[PDB]
Design a protein around this nucleic acid. Structure first.
Lengths: 217, 314, 410
DNA sequence: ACGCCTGCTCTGAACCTGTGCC
DNA sequence: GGCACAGGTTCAGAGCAGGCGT
């Protein structure tokens, strides 16, 4: 942690700083949880326009969210916030995140984080709204993203997503207007979890949009 | 024949179940609309609901032209009386919401509304739109399909408001001819003034709208008159709406502030004078707020080595 | 000690010019108490008082300096510093323009009182000397008047006498410098238009231009200095041409907008009559310019371009009368009149001028030359195009209101 | 006749020539 | 003949006018 501060404020060669950055990420498995946040910011300040996929790709593999479990959930939130603040501020990072999830359409063993990031990035970043929905259809059609993922997301990460109420449902409304009962199944399950876990306002919006289907669709 | 003022609504709920033609539904509803005038206000909303569900197999142009022409007259008469507010705000609102829950199931309802509220040529926009038409649109921005369409109209109209008036105020010949119909910033602001009685849907649209104008027409030509002034003027407006909005609606003034900070912070990739100039006058009017939003200014400072100097200073 | 050394003075002058220029570019100047707007407002006005007083107390005719030091005359520089002050207070401190003139009753009366001074100064500058007149100081007096003129209220008595005086100066004086003349006419129109349409004015300039330059046919009698005196061989030829047609454009800008809003509608009758009266008057303007022997630069292009834009407005008008005239039986004697002159006087002289200009034919990088000449070949056709597309909507109009408007056309 | 794409028109910036003066 | 201001010229791109699919 402080080392990180010092090596940020010393007068150095960049290749050295890269080397040490990887000397983090190999042991990113191995940080005590509290300390995760503070590193990750550095990594996403240690990004140039050209370093991006490489680092996110490794990180997108490296990062778990499964491993990390009341201080746990608080620290996880801190995490997503820090990310939240990064992704807020680099158009380069948001686009590249998604290009380095869809390049992992291949292994149908890709993980929880690859939803939560989309939903976050949909909510947070708006330029991408078309793109996540394209990817989400293309990936779920492929026999990737399914139940076991989406169930797992809203059983542990409700409190993350509570915030992204309106984001989940903009999506759910985008999915039921489709063909292919695989897609519409997902867009439904969306509504079921949305209505189970969120606020009463979210519940009202669920039934609101259900009616809208029933009378138009 | 004359309708029993008491149960005119209940009679209009009967043509709901009969199969009719266009001419038939049109005749019955234009009479049900003649009847708003000779009623109490609090029963107009459910009548409007039972008009719309009829208008689903009938005239929509007519239903919404009626509600709009009626409330347009109402608000003008409330204005020149000021030169029954605490409930006139409940009706306008409840109606916008009741027409929302319909355009929700009836995507053609929305399209006919929108066609009705086109600028097209600017002479239709100086008889069409209103301080009520626009609360209604800026509720409508909440429908997922409809947000975008709506905003785009408002924004582009906004500019002409500046361009007519700007080109008008160059010239005396033009001022002689036109009897000056209140212009579009004014109207949008009178919404905001009306807003107080807390129809909180319109707000999502305002805030959305407001940063659209500044993000759109910001200083970047400046790091003419034609491509300059009705874009600065536009920007001013964005700012003007939000500051006035921030003053009124204690609920919103968290996420005006964050949405500013957002655009302030990582850029100076692009200029941001305007956002800091707003940011001033936001915090100048009521800076208790940042006590409530303290996490967010904390994590503007964590970029306060990378930020350029003139920004950081201000 | 310091009053003996003239150089010391024109230092502390140049310094002041540097301060005010610095304030324009950034909201603040250099030193301490150069960010606190209050203090800058204080000083500006405190500087102003003295700079005004110098110029007042000491004219430019009391010099013993010669050309080298009259290029940096202490008088001259103080008016340039005035100009930027008056300028840059309107940029920032538009609210305190009252406190600003309280340093020198509403805003407009103080305006007039302050105007008269510079007005008379300029007049004495001009009236006195011809031989080697102060171009610069006369011109930037004109510029200060222009900047500050825009603070008079447009219906005020002081505005009326300003315009009267303005146009009167343009009507009397010779003044061979064209950039000078340019500045006056600019100021005249900028004032004039926010009282009324500037159309007779354009007419008058064109009649004087027609008078002075001569005529296409090499036998038409023209001289009309009588209207406006600040028009020359030198002046009117590249300059008052571009401006007089520039001001015609702003006419037809308003007329295009008029017709867009009118066709929205379908109040009407008065607006049509007004538009046709406008168009009739400035069709006399186009007449005098066409008959003129215009040189072949932007002068000829901007006439031919504006004849296109005259005809395009006439196209929008005729196509307007087609939508509506089917429903009633329209085209009142207003429009019949306009169409008559647009055929009888206008169109055939369009042909005789363009034919004369293209008849007129009296080292080149091949690429640049090819790019230039095939750019410049469009507008003789765009005029013949624009005319024939007028004639189209007139044949359409002739049939679809039951009046044969081709009985007028040759 | 409404939606989508392109290309044209404006706008000012910077470049370097072009010509007048000493 | 060199020293200097003004003009016009090419550019470079923003941002909307209008031809062309359903």
């Amino acid at each position: 942690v402080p080392i990180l501060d010092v090596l940020s404020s010393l007068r150095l060669d960049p290749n050295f700083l890269l080397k040490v950055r990887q000397l983090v990420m190999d042991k990113l498995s191995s940080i005590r949880l509290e300390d995760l946040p503070v590193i990750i910011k550095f990594i996403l300040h240690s990004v140039t326009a050209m370093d991006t996929l490489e680092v996110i790709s490794e990180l997108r593999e490296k990062l778990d969210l499964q491993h990390c479990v009341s201080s746990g959930q608080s620290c996880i939130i801190l995490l997503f916030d820090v990310i939240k603040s990064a992704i807020r501020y680099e158009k380069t990072i948001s686009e590249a995140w998604i290009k380095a999830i869809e390049n992992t359409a291949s292994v149908s063993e890709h993980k929880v984080f690859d939803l939560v990031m989309l939903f976050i990035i949909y909510s947070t970043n708006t330029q991408t709204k078309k793109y996540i929905d394209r990817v989400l259809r293309n990936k779920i059609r492929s026999g990737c993203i399914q139940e076991q993922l989406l169930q797992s997301t809203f059983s542990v990460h409700y409190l993350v997503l509570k915030d992204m109420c309106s984001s989940i449902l903009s999506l759910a409304q985008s999915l039921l207007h489709s063909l292919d009962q695989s897609i519409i199944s997902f867009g439904s399950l969306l509504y079921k979890y949305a209505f189970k876990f969120f606020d009463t306002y979210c519940q009202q919006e669920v039934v609101g949009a259900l009616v809208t289907h029933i009378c138009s669709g | 024949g004359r309708w029993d003022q008491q149960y005119v609504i209940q009679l209009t709920s009967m043509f709901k179940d009969v199969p009719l033609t266009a001419e038939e539904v049109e005749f019955v509803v234009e009479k049900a609309l003649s009847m708003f005038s000779k009623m109490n206000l609090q029963e107009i909303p459910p009548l409007v609901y039972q008009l719309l569900v009829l208008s689903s197999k009938g005239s929509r142009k007519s239903v919404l032209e009626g509600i709009i022409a009626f409330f347009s007259a109402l608000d003008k008469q409330h204005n020149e009386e000021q030169s029954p507010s605490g409930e006139l705000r409940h009706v306008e609102g409840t109606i916008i919401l009741h027409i929302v829950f319909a355009i929700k199931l009836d995507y053609e309802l929305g399209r006919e509304l929108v066609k009705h509220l086109k600028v097209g040529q600017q002479g239709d926009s100086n008889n069409n739109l209103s301080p009520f038409s626009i609360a209604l649109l800026l509720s409508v921005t909440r429908i997922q399909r409809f947000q975008d369409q709506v905003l785009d109209l408002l924004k582009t109209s906004v500019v002409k408001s500046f361009k007519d008036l700007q080109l008008l105020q160059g010239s005396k010949f033009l001022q002689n001819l036109v009897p000056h119909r209140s212009y579009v910033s004014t109207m949008i602001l009178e919404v905001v003034k009306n807003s107080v009685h807390s129809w909180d849907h319109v707000t999502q649209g305002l805030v959305e709208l407001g940063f659209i104008l500044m993000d759109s027409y910001g200083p970047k030509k400046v790091l003419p008159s034609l491509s300059r002034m009705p874009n600065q003027h536009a920007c001013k407006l964005g700012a003007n709406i939000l500051l006035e909005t921030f003053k009124i609606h204690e609920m919103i003034r968290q996420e005006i502030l964050e949405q500013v900070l957002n655009r302030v912070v990582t850029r100076a990739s692009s200029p941001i004078s305007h956002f800091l100039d707003l940011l001033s006058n936001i915090v100048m009017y009521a800076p208790l707020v940042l006590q409530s939003c303290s996490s967010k200014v904390t994590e503007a400072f964590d970029y306060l080595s990378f930020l350029p100097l003139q920004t950081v200073q201000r | 000690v310091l009053r003996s050394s003239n150089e010391f003075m024109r230092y502390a002058v140049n310094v002041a010019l540097q301060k005010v220029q610095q304030l324009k570019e950034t909201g603040h100047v250099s030193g301490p108490d150069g960010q606190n707007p209050e203090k800058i407002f204080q000083n500006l006005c405190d500087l102003t008082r003295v700079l005004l007083w110098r110029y007042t107390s000491i004219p430019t005719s009391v010099e013993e300096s010669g050309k080298k030091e009259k290029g940096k005359s202490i008088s001259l520089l103080c008016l340039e510093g005035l100009q930027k002050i008056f300028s840059a207070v309107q940029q920032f401190y538009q609210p305190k323009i009252q406190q600003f003139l309280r340093a020198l009753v509403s805003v407009t009366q103080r305006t007039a009182f302050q105007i008269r001074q510079f007005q008379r100064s300029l007049l004495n500058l001009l009236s006195s000397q011809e031989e080697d007149f102060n171009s610069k100081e006369a011109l930037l007096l004109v510029t200060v008047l222009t900047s500050l003129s825009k603070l008079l209220e447009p219906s005020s008595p002081q505005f009326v006498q300003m315009l009267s005086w303005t146009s009167k100066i343009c009507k009397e004086n010779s003044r061979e410098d064209a950039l000078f003349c340019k500045s006056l006419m600019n100021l005249l129109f900028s004032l004039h238009v926010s009282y009324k349409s500037p159309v007779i004015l354009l007419r008058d300039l064109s009649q004087d231009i027609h008078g002075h330059l001569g005529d296409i046919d090499q036998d038409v009698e023209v001289e009309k200095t009588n209207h406006f005196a600040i028009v020359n061989l030198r002046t009117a030829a590249p300059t008052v041409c571009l401006l007089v047609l520039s001001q015609a454009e702003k006419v037809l800008e308003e007329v295009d907008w008029l017709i867009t809003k009118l066709k929205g509608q379908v109040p009407n009758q008065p607006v049509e009559k007004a538009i046709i009266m406008q168009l009739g008057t400035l069709l006399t303007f186009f007449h005098e310019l066409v008959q003129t022997a215009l040189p072949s630069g932007s002068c000829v292009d901007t006439l031919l371009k504006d004849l296109c834009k005259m005809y395009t407005t006439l196209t929008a008008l005729v196509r307007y009368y087609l939508q509506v005239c089917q429903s009633s039986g329209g085209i009142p004697k207003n429009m019949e009149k306009l169409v008559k002159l647009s055929g009888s006087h206008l169109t055939p002289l369009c042909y005789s001028f363009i034919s004369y200009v293209q008849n007129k034919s009296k080292p080149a990088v091949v690429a640049t030359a090819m790019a230039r000449v095939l750019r410049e070949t469009k507008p003789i056709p765009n005029l013949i195009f624009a005319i024939e597309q007028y004639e189209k909507f007139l044949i359409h109009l002739s049939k679809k209101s039951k009046v044969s408007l081709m009985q007028h056309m040759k």
